[PDB]
């Protein structure tokens, strides 16, 4: 009944991450018997102050999700987090909208439990060191700091894509994420801007414990580079007041509870 230590005694540090040997979700449920229906886990040893909803923007990436679940589930437990896994599956075939799904993940996960922390994670990013905690900090946290994709370097100091974490309040303070970014790129830069325009700075683990692997993959159809991103990014200051949580509309088509996660299929509209 005593709180979990600040740093988990279960940590292993650097880890081997590879995507060659096929995974069997059944074998994963097997290895992770503590994860309950829906992909919920709560430490029974101590009391974590980190009630974390991990939100994954999704559409046709089940193979990546397999690896994600396999690697992350053991890690999140090692980190003694009271967590929930949410896969926000974009229904349909129109342009992919990453940030909007993230917004949905926020509202949907809140329907389940009183989470105070939100980790937005893409499906293809695996942390290579368990010291890179998936929780919230005194400032918005950028987690996928050093991706093999970028030579294990932050590509630019203003970068906020991949995996990040905002407390409920930090998130609420910026009207959440934007819903108007259709297609690839820029939404993460917009989110970055939103933080600065609200007095928040970015917190990050250093480049060594922040090492991360992104499963190699090609850009998906219906998620082409958004030709407008650069212009939309220049107006974040004004648009963030009218495009975000407060302007979110979506319809839930299906809520699925598997043993290792909760997948929610939603209709989020079209680029208009």
């Amino acid at each position: 009944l005593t709180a979990c230590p600040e740093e988990s005694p279960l940590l292993v540090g650097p880890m081997l991450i590879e995507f060659n040997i096929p995974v069997d979700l059944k074998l994963v449920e097997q290895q992770n018997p503590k994860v309950k229906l829906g992909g919920r886990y709560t430490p029974m040893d101590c009391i974590s102050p980190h009630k974390v909803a991990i939100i994954i923007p999704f559409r046709n990436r089940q193979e990546h999700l397999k690896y994600w679940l396999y690697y992350l589930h053991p890690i999140l437990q090692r980190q003694q987090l009271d967590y929930g896994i949410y896969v926000i599956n974009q229904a349909g075939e129109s342009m992919f909208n990453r940030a909007k799904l993230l917004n949905v993940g926020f509202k949907e996960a809140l329907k389940d439990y009183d989470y105070n922390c939100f980790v937005f994670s893409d499906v293809d990013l695996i942390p290579m060191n368990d010291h890179n905690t998936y929780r919230c900090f005194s400032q918005p946290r950028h987690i996928s700091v050093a991706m093999d994709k970028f030579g294990f370097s932050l590509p630019y100091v203003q970068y906020f894509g991949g995996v990040s974490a905002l407390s409920k309040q930090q998130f609420l303070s910026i009207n959440g994420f934007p819903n108007n970014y259709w297609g690839w790129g820029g939404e993460d830069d917009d989110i970055y801007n939103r933080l600065a325009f609200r007095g928040m700075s970015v917190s990050r683990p250093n480049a060594v414990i922040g090492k991360c692997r992104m499963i190699r993959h090609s850009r998906d159809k219906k998620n082409e580079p958004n030709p407008q991103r650069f212009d939309r990014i220049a107006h974040t200051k004004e648009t963030m007041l009218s495009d975000g949580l407060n302007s979110l509309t979506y319809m839930v088509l299906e809520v699925q509870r598997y043993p290792l996660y909760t997948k929610i299929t939603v209709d989020i509209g079209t680029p208009s």
Partner: protein
């Protein structure tokens, strides 16, 4: 061909300073423009942008599907998809002289500050 900051920086030397843009700014603009990929191809509004610089076939190069284009740079767009940057650079130079750095939309919003991070730190 996915290049790197330093590779880009060394292959791009001849353009440094032209129209007042430094190598720090180009490294920044090019990362956001094509992720340094010389074979980057992207659609916009019924037109295509080619290579490291994302030169458009609308007015700058000739693409088989746009024999009408002004082809201001006088080159086939496919020549901007190989790994020889000489012609890409000369074309980029013309765009700078004519339309200016604002052709690259990532410049203002992404490369207006914090340029030191874009320097190549390898000899």
């Amino acid at each position: 061909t996915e290049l790197t900051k330093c590779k880009v920086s060394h292959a791009i030397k001849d353009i440094d300073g032209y129209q007042g843009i430094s190598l720090l700014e180009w490294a920044c603009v090019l990362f956001h423009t094509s992720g340094y990929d010389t074979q980057a191809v992207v659609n916009d509004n019924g037109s295509t942008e080619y290579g490291l610089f994302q030169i458009s076939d609308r007015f700058w190069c000739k693409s088989s599907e746009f024999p009408e284009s002004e082809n201001i740079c006088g080159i086939s767009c496919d020549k901007l998809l190989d790994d020889e940057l000489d012609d890409d650079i000369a074309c980029a130079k013309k765009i700078l002289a004519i339309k200016g750095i604002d052709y690259w939309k990532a410049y203002k919003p992404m490369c207006s500050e914090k340029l030191e991070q874009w320097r190549c730190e390898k000899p």
